[PDB]
């Protein structure tokens, strides 16, 4: 086509979606990770995770307001990944890398899994 | 912080939200523009438009499944802007620029209004 493109549009959209998340506006699901609860937008979770995409396209699970993750999932690893979904920034540290990688594999977040594998390979 | 950032994340999120829109997945509102209807995600509309942000943060309108725009709004201008919201690409043409600018002013989409004003100033 003959379209023009606004370079910062995608980043500005995500920044605003994160602002809605911070003020708990139009969040439509609670993700339960052991004793912790995380409110989010189903659409953002689906756009970032192969697991949430599969969950919310299911004719029965699409209507659930609460999703319980596997008990092996670490709440801090989930929190770091939820922040990454809404910001593009990943708080990857020596102390959390194993939990973050395991959570990203479970959530089917291929690019996060890739950088975790590379950071782990550099330290061996 | 000491975060790392995935450059293409925001663009990949928006691409996936547009894929959900194309398959009519988790759309939660109909925007009525005269005889035309447009299905969309409330969160994406709020993230792109000062008007939709004001509408869906209202304690009564946040719950509406149908929103009727002012009858002066052109359905083609709206369609072009809805496409821009989900893609960052604006199909701006000599034949549609006046309708697109008027629709962007009504929707409170400041960056679109700015480029329309500049393209109009260049042709005078």
């Amino acid at each position: 086509d003959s379209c023009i493109q606004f370079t910062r549009h995608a980043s500005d959209v995500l920044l605003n979606l994160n602002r809605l998340r911070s003020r708990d506006i139009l969040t439509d699901v609670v993700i339960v990770v052991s004793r912790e609860q995380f409110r989010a937008h189903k659409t953002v979770l689906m756009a970032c995770s192969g697991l949430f995409y599969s969950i919310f396209t299911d004719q029965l699970k699409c209507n659930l307001s609460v999703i319980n993750l596997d008990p092996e999932i670490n709440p801090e690893g989930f929190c770091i990944l939820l922040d990454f979904m809404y910001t593009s920034r990943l708080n990857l540290r020596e102390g959390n890398i194993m939990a973050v990688m395991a959570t990203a594999m479970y959530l089917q977040m291929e690019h996060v899994v890739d950088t975790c594998r590379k950071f782990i390979k550099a330290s061996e | 912080d000491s975060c790392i950032q995935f450059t293409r994340h925001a663009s990949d999120v928006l691409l996936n939200l547009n894929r959900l829109r194309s398959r009519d997945i988790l759309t939660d509102v109909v925007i009525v523009v005269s005889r035309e209807q447009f299905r969309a995600h409330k969160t994406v509309l709020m993230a792109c438009s000062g008007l939709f942000y004001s509408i869906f943060t209202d304690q009564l309108k946040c719950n509406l499944s149908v929103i009727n725009l002012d009858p002066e709004i052109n359905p083609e201008g709206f369609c072009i802007l809805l496409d821009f919201m989900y893609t960052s690409r604006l199909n701006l043409r000599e034949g549609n620029i006046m309708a697109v600018m008027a629709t962007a002013m009504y929707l409170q989409m400041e960056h679109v209004v700015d480029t329309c004003r500049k393209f109009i100033k260049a042709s005078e």
């Binding site: 023009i4 493109q5 370079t7 | 690409r89």
Partner: peptide
Amino acid sequence: WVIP
């Protein structure tokens, strides 16, 4: 704005 750019030409994509």
